[PDB]
Amino acid sequence: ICQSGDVLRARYEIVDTLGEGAFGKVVECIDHGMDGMHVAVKIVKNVGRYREAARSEIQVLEHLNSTDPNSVFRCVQMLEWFDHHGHVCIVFELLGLSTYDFIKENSFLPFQIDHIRQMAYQICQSINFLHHNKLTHTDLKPENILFVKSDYVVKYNKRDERTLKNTDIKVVDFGSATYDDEHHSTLVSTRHYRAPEVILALGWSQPCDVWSIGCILIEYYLGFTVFQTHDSKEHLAMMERILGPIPQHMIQKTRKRKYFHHNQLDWDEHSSAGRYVRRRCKPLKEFMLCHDEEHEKLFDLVRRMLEYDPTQRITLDEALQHPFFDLLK
Ligand SMILES: O=C(O)c1ccc2c(c1)nc(Nc1cccc(Cl)c1)c1ccncc12
Known part of the structure; x- marks a missing residue:
């Protein structure tokens, strides 16, 4: 689910928890696909309430990136999102x-x-x-x-x-x-x-x-x-x-x-x-x-x-x- 050393989308290696909440966690990851640079990843726990809300959050973030790609x-700049076995993962700038x-x-x-x-x-x-x-x-x-x-x-x-x-x-x-x-x-x-x-x-x-x-x-x-x-x-x-x-x-x-x-x-x-x-x-x-x-x-x-x-x-x-x-x- 979520571990120090765990890898998301064959790419992001969790190396530190940055914080927690009712939604889930935000972790610091090494992005091996971008030769090492660090990112923050919001992992959303598999409650149907939080899952449908994240898909609305994703929509807003895509909107803000579209209208203002250069911030x-x-x-905050969302870099990508993906599903990781029921948990919605959103990748952000660190x-x-x-x-x-x-x-x-x-x-x-x-x-x-x-x-x-x-x-x-x-x-x-x-x-x-x-x-x-x-x-x-x-x-x-x-x-x-x-x-x-x-x-x-x-x-x-x-x-x-x-x-x-x-x-x-x-x-x-x-x-x-x-x-x-x-x-x-x-x-x-x-x-x-x-x-x-x-x-x-x-x-x-x-x-x-x-x-x-x-x-x-x-x-x-x-x-x-x-x-x-x-x-x-x-x-x-x-x-x-x-x-x-x-x-x-x-x-x-x-x-x-x-x-x-x-x-x-x-x-x-x-x-x-x-x-x-x-x-x-x-x-x-x-x-x-x-x-x-x-x-x-x-x-x-x-x-x-x-x-x-x-x-x-x-x-x-x-x-x-x-x-x-x-x-x-
Ligand atoms: O929600 C976002 O859009 C969102 C987006 C980016 C960050 C974030 C939340 N939360 C962070 N930290 C944090 C600190 C305290 C509690 C929790 Cl749960 C998380 C954090 C840290 C470093 N870089 C980016 C982020």
Whole structure:
């Protein structure tokens, strides 16, 4: 099935597990057919659910390769796919650590505002390309943003701390990507990066990605997940504490009645969970570690990404032309 030394399509020799999930595994292989060069191979376990989903992911990746074969817009490059005894195998270019894992290995230290500016721009560009081709990723998170090379310099400070030689990224995991004119799932996104219109089941499209990007940028800035919760009402409570009250037209629209009471969130601030929310969250501007002009610009862009109403949320067309990105051009 999957072993170190095992060979796929008479070619790819597994030499290291790079990670695991509910789908299966992603392994590093030596490609003997390309005189040794390393690749990453997503092996999908033989559950009928994951098999049919992979064939949709494959279709998206072929689409992105067709429209952008040279990865101008930084989507991961699929090299081939094949069946290996019931397991769907997808071969990818070999990339570095995820932006999540880099933080994790760097003592949970945040990225410097200048690295954030570069990465944010690349992320926005990549996802805007998806949005102009009638796609929504739906699952953007730091784990799905990977460095091309994770090469770092160690500099003693309090002890050892890491800095990227290069911040160029790629976006991975198109297994949930959805076209405009296709069946939209009810529930999308990993919990922490999920937009309020999803939680409230009002229907979603492109803008839900922008919300996720917002969540990602904050997490880069602070070095920790802002919505650390496994409960939807609590999640909504965290949003209100950070962002202000949920707009009334959205509360009126939702069928999710259990969250509300008289069109206000049914949340007790003086509970065990209420105390947890309050010590973990605060109004957005109060998160600013430094009070520079560019930090104000960043927090302005983030606020616009974290607009409650998806119809009023900043688009990525607009985001790319935001003052925060001026210092890059
Ligand atoms: O899904 C894709 O499209 C996808 C595409 C490429 C990679 C990937 C996922 N995941 C990687 N690593 C990884 C890290 C943590 C957990 C898991 Cl399951 C995998 C990885 C590593 C090195 N090069 C390319 C990749």
